[PDB]
Amino acid sequence: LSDDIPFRVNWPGTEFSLPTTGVLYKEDNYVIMTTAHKEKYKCILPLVTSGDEEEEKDYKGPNPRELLEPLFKQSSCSYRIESYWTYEVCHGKHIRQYHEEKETGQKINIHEYYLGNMLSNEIPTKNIEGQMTPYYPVGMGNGTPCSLKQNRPRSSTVMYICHPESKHEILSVAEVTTCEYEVVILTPLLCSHPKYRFRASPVNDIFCQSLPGSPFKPLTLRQLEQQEEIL
Amino acid sequence: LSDDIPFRVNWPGTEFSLPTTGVLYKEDNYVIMTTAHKEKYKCILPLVTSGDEEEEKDYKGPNPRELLEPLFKQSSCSYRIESYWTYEVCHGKHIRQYHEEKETGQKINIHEYYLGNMLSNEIPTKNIEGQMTPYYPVGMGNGTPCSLKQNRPRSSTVMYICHPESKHEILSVAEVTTCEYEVVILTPLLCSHPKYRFRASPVNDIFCQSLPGSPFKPLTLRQLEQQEEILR
Amino acid sequence: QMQEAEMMYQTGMKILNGSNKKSQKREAYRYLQKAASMNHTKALERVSYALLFGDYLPQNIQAAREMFEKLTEEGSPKGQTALGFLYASGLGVNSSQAKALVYYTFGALGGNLIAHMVLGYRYWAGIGVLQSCESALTHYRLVANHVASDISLTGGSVVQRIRLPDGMAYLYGRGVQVNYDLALKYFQKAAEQGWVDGQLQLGSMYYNGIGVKRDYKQALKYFNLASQGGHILAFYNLAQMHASGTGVMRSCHTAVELFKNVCERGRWSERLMTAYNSYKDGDYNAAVIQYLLLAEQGYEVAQSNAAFILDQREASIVGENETYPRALLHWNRAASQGYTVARIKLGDYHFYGFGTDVDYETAFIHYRLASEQQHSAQAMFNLGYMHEKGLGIKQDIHLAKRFYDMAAEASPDAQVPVFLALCKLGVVYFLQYIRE
Amino acid sequence: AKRRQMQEAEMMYQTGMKILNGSNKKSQKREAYRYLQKAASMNHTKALERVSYALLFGDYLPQNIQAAREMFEKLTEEGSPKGQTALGFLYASGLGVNSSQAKALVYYTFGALGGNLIAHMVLGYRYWAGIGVLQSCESALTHYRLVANHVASDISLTGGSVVQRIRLPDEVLYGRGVQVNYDLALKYFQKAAEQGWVDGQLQLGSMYYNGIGVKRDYKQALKYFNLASQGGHILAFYNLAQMHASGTGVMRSCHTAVELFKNVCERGRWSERLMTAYNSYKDGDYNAAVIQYLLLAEQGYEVAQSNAAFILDQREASIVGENETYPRALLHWNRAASQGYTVARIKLGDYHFYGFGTDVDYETAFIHYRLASEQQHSAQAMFNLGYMHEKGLGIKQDIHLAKRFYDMAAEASPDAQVPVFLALCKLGVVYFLQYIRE
Amino acid sequence: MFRTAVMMAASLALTGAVVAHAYYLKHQFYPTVVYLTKSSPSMAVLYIQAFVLVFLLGKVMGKVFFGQLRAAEMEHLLERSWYAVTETCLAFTVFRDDFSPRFVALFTLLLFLKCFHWLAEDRVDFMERSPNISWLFHCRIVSLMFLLGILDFLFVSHAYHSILTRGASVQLVFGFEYAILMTMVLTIFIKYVLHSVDLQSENPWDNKAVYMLYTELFTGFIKVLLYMAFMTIMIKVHTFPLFAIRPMYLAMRQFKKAVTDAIMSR
Amino acid sequence: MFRTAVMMAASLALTGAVVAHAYYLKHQFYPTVVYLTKSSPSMAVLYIQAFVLVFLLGKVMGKVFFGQLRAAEMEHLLERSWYAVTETCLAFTVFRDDFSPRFVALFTLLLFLKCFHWLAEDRVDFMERSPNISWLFHCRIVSLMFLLGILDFLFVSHAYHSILTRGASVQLVFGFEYAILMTMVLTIFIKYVLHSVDLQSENPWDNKAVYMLYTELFTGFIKVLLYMAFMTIMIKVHTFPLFAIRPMYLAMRQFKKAVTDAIMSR
């Protein structure tokens, strides 16, 4: 029932005009209010729609291909630890997965596989954690042959998702078919474009007016706010 | 040797001259010290003497009664509660020892006992809690007769010992003999006179010279210094 | 004329406190209603908080809301809270979260700890507001302080969390709670071997002397009381260490859930039996309403319990076309708090199409989140079947084969279904091999 | 060859440390100590400390102060944080070295800069009781919090293994509901066990021998609950101290902050040394049962201060001179006095009374008994108070206030009735004889 | 009396040894006495010393108040003492008064007083058939019968006032024991009065002796009824005493011998 | 027998009823079978129904392989099955392998194989003195013997691979039992070959008895060696077997009845 709709109550004071842009504010939706210390408040709410995409999405920047160029040139790679295998992922060079077999004392066996090698108006959108978000797909293959596919080189696609606290790490590992896997990578630079930014619903603000004879906002959250400040 | 003499660590740096006033500094009681990060410190120690009293005790202040007259004329006096009794002392006026018995509903009996009324090159000194401190007494007598001694009227001695934070409070009450009493009062005033101030032992400072190639302040202490004040 | 109402309310309170009998409780409730007939506030709210829930008075939702109107016009600190509760989950009234927000915030304005708990929970897990750290943490501390105030004195009554469907985030610290755990389990094993009387041989048990095992489990329950009391004290203390700045560095995301655990145990969590008892003898119309308050407060157990009894369409207030969306809502809330079975229930919700449209991709992602995080063979087998028949994504065999194998060694009881499934898969493969 | 010698020393010390970590046998500990001695022969500083704190305290090696000292100068000129602490301890307690307090303070501070913990605890206590320095809040506050952080951090992981404070001269704002539930459950369990089927004198004969099966796991439950309740209370103290010091909730209050910090520090990890000393006083080895106690007394314990004073009292310890064993016991008696111990104040009075250590002084022993009677209600203190009043020791001889002091000695405790009765009869007899002689 | 002196010397040596052993550990007065009180062998040896001193004092008192025993009431006194000691031990163990150095002496004093009362009763019985008794013995027995009775009454008043000002405790039973002792003292006084009549008349008196015996029997029956009434109040409060039944049986036997004697005389 | 069909129908109805009930409680395939496995009143039904179905399948197989029972081997088969079932239950509880519904099917298959081997031995015993045997019976016997040999070889190969790959487990005893059955089938094959050789010629063969005696002696020696090796293997590892003692006694009796008879004859 639309859990992800945000709200926030503010106290603009006594005299205030309902904004027109964005959401619309009516008058019959008003609510009588009284506090424990006999303060009379008159509060109003908007219609919770937050529909359409009239955010004036103007982007004069180029395509996101140049954004990931420094990652390719840097050649600094991260790793990911799984239950058995170790998926080592690099952008621009290859994607390799291996499992270490530590023999007793002298040698260490290696079981290394090769995922692949690298020698439109509606942007595609994938569902991650139940949420719809755009992503930029890439295509590469020419990996180690698989007997299940009759000596067919593997192919995989790298997924790009933004996160402000990401360090080019791997979120999860999944496969679409035998010898056909998919790698999810969190890059913090791709979302700078408004189209590629994280799909966050804009906040819808509720103002609750304070009529004269009472202060602009109620009296207990004062001492609550100094208390939270000195703790 | 004891738990009286205090010490303080000082870091003057590299250049420092041994003071010839106060404690005495000799060149034999030095220690070369190396800390964890390989800085060298030359720490010199003061001689633990703390002797004599050549503090130039020369003050032209008023008489001892001058600092006591305003307190006696204040007419605002304190109380104290004991296990059974409650000794109320009113400086310059009288001391009342009593206990209020609360009968079941109507009577409130007060068992009053009267402690009295009012109508030298070496200052005498008294020991409290193992520390020897000079005071100012108030001789006083002619209380209520004490029946154990064929009705000799009681006596009481008012003991004055100052304390920088004070509210004219009673620290202790004593019974040196039956029906002869000794009560003490702590006030922040009378030790402006030369002798009745608490005898603080001089703080024997120790200096840790910083040899060349090392900072005048160790790094761990340097960070702990601002750590305390930001956490203050 | 108010003195008579005060006397009646005092008599009802005395009857309720001195006697826990059902008839005495009913008489006290009737006296409280008589006192509230002249609009006396305290007994009015006392009968209000049970009349709506039931198991004390008949459940009259519409009269409850009409009463709550004037209760809130008076300025009752606890009247705002339940009215916002009712308006939140669409209980007998159209649902909208903004008026519920203002009502809840003015209840917490008046000092109601239920309302501070509510504000802290809905700010923490971003429902009705934007997700944040500071506000939820502050509102949670404002209730947890009083929680320990009750725990340190009364002893902190221990309640048994029952489910009707039945950094440093690994343990939120170590040490003291671990040794509480070993102490409790040593006490349990001691009491259990104390009950043993198989080597009696005309003695020991004293020929059905029940008067020794009753005290044994009574002492066990009292030690349980003490041990979980110490557990809660320790957890609040580590929450305050992790909270402000000290011991370990500033860490909101490993402090708020510890605070929430401390508040969750608390004293409000006695309505759990008041609702489970109501459910156990019919009375399915009171279970969802007593559970909804605790599921607005944020209880994972209450969230899953209310959702389970809604999923089987026995709630009578909600329309039968609305029970499925609400149950989906509350199961998703239980999923947000990490309750495993809610994830598989949500996946089936997206799978057979309960409430929401049939969409296999969503079902697959809930099944996968249930699989690799909680290591649950149920949803994982379900997604193995997804690969097996080929819904949503491409069709093959070897994938589903290896997840069936991992289901085989994942849980000891999963020996037989995967075997049947593998037999069916092998039969299909052999028929295809025959067809090839 | 220096690198090869260092590698061999490292291998030998690592083997000894592994033996110590994996084996708790006394012979194994002694063999490991011999190995660490071999490692200290070629100046392995880690092994140097690990064998100096065992050849000075004498816990796993035969004790010898002199060798410990001669290797302590080198452990300090290299700059160890754990050789400056023990050198400061030696200089503070006059142990085999010229006594001095300034040197002790500078060594303790330079142990504090090197990151040592015991130097921080020692400096905190000596800033808190005003020994050797100016009594202060802030300095003791910092040097106590720096160990409080560490101890709370290690307790939040491992739980902080329990230690009970046994007393040689005696044996030889939250948490009410939890404790009342605990001991009420304990009494219910006890009466459950005693009801049984006559768990003691049963039918018996040749005994059933079915096995008790209840004592050991019950004792484990008690001890683990003790550890966890101590943990809960020590984090409670830490939280309350931070609340009192940072100013949040309660405005900065000095005394309570340092007080709860002290009470937090004392229950730390080093306190297993308490058992280490007492198990060496049994078996009859005082010369290592006074050093392991003198150090813990310097740290700030009151149990260690009373035990070190009680060992030094009876002239048992042989390292300290017989010419100084009483003043070096009077120091610890005074220290355990100011920290609130009855027997400490009474024995301080006795020392000033008989003229032990210092000259005879009736007046101040009088004052000490008065303090031990009024502040802490000690029966014996006020008993000897009445005795001093009776024969006019220190002040004028009076015959009535003595009777009052004896009588309320009788009222204050139920164990003083026999000596007070006998002494009161003696009082009456001498009063009657004096009256008859008049 | 060489053996008694040797035993007393050995007991004195033992208590001297224990106090020296105590004083060597704790060199001061108060810890010495408190350790002597606390430790079990020390209180036991002091209990033996107290018992020996009490036995010597009782022998001295018997020598002073009685010129020579008749060698025929020693077994009767021993049996009564054994019964009284058993009753006192049962009362102490039932009241749960615990072993303290304040109530054991009360039981010892009560046993000594009971022995003295039994000796006084035997002396009066012997004097009832004594044809040659000096005035000195008659004047000294009355003095002992009066002083002991006065002391018993004073102790009874002290205990009764303490119990009333405190409440129901074990001292009530001691009060009842002292009341029985006071009744015995009254009976001894009546016996002296009866002997006075026999002493002054050189002719037997049948009616006077019968009346005196009936009055003594009635007084004893009243005392027995009072003791039974006091005993019966211990059931509703506290618990079953499981003691003081042998004296009740003896009291009932005396009451029956009184009723039967009165019936036969009538 | 119609009663057996009625019992099978009742078992099928009971299984269908409990499965339908479990389906009614939990609506999905996975949760409706965990309830079946872990709960007692539903899990107890299934393996009884499995045993009934196994018995029906065995009867059907015997009906196809054998034209009609002679009503003489039924009691012997029942006794052998009772002994083998007791042995299997004892071995099932001795090793502490817990109750798992995956190893019971192997024990049931082993019991079916043992029953088939006993029936084959009884049929060879009858065929020894059978003067009118058609080619169909011989072909069926040969096919059954070949199938049993192939199954025993496959079982032994699996057991040997499990023993060498996993380690010491319960599969070693199963492999030993498979080897014992394989020896019993080699003996039956030798007896059938000797009987066919005698039957092909219209004259008795004196060397046939000697060859049969030598084969019986060799089989008894092999069985004794296998039993001794099994005893040593069970003594060394795991715990005390306390089983396979009656079969060891039977093997020793066969070895004696071979060796002593050969010694007496030769």
Ligand SMILES: *[C@@H]1O[C@H](CO)[C@@H](O[C@@H]2O[C@H](CO)[C@@H](O[C@H]3O[C@H](CO[C@H]4O[C@H](CO[C@H]5O[C@H](CO)[C@@H](O)[C@H](O)[C@@H]5O)[C@@H](O)[C@H](O[C@H]5O[C@H](CO)[C@@H](O)[C@H](O)[C@@H]5O)[C@@H]4O)[C@@H](O[C@H]4O[C@H](CO)[C@@H](O)[C@H](O)[C@@H]4O)[C@H](O)[C@@H]3O)[C@H](O)[C@H]2NC(C)=O)[C@H](O)[C@H]1NC(C)=O
């Ligand atoms: C917890 O708190 C409770 C408070 O309620 C404590 O209760 C105690 O209660 C008892 C009552 O049973 C109190 O005992 C006595 O109380 C009064 C007052 O007596 C006190 O004062 C006596 C005065 O004597 C001297 O007083 C002057 C002081 O300046 C002298 O100058 C003067 O010359 C005089 O000599 C004092 O003598 C006495 O101490 C002892 O002194 C004599 C001499 O040595 C002893 O023999 C006595 O035995 C006595 O113990 C007390 O300090 C008293 O009433 C008096 O006055 C009334 C007036 O009508 C007379 O009728 C009466 O006869 C008597 O003369 C009582 O009779 C009683 O004896 C006791 O004081 C309370 N204790 C405290 C500490 O308050 C309870 O003990 C506490 N529990 C604890 C601490 O564990």
Ligand SMILES: *[C@@H]1O[C@H](CO)[C@@H](O)[C@H](O)[C@H]1NC(C)=O
């Ligand atoms: C007060 O009580 C009366 C009862 O007579 C009721 O009619 C009235 O509505 C109440 N007041 C409010 C504000 O509801």
Ligand SMILES: *[C@@H]1O[C@H](CO)[C@@H](O)[C@H](O)[C@H]1NC(C)=O
């Ligand atoms: C709730 O709101 C809806 C839409 O605004 C309206 O149709 C309905 O009548 C309302 N119900 C109530 C009880 O106010």
Ligand SMILES: *[C@@H]1O[C@H](CO)[C@@H](O)[C@H](O)[C@H]1NC(C)=O
């Ligand atoms: C629920 O509401 C909508 C309105 O048409 C629809 O799905 C259905 O008719 C309603 N359900 C019932 C049971 O009427």
Ligand SMILES: *[C@@H]1O[C@H](CO)[C@@H](O)[C@H](O)[C@H]1NC(C)=O
């Ligand atoms: C340090 O090691 C050397 C190497 O043998 C040794 O000679 C020297 O004595 C050691 N230092 C001291 C102070 O003993």
Ligand SMILES: *[C@@H]1O[C@H](CO)[C@@H](O)[C@H](O)[C@H]1NC(C)=O
């Ligand atoms: C310490 O004192 C003793 C006693 O006089 C003296 O012999 C010794 O030299 C002193 N120590 C130092 C380092 O001077």
Ligand SMILES: *[C@@H]1O[C@H](CO)[C@@H](O)[C@H](O)[C@H]1NC(C)=O
């Ligand atoms: C301690 O003092 C005594 C007192 O004169 C003196 O003999 C010496 O300095 C010390 N005693 C001994 C035995 O050395």
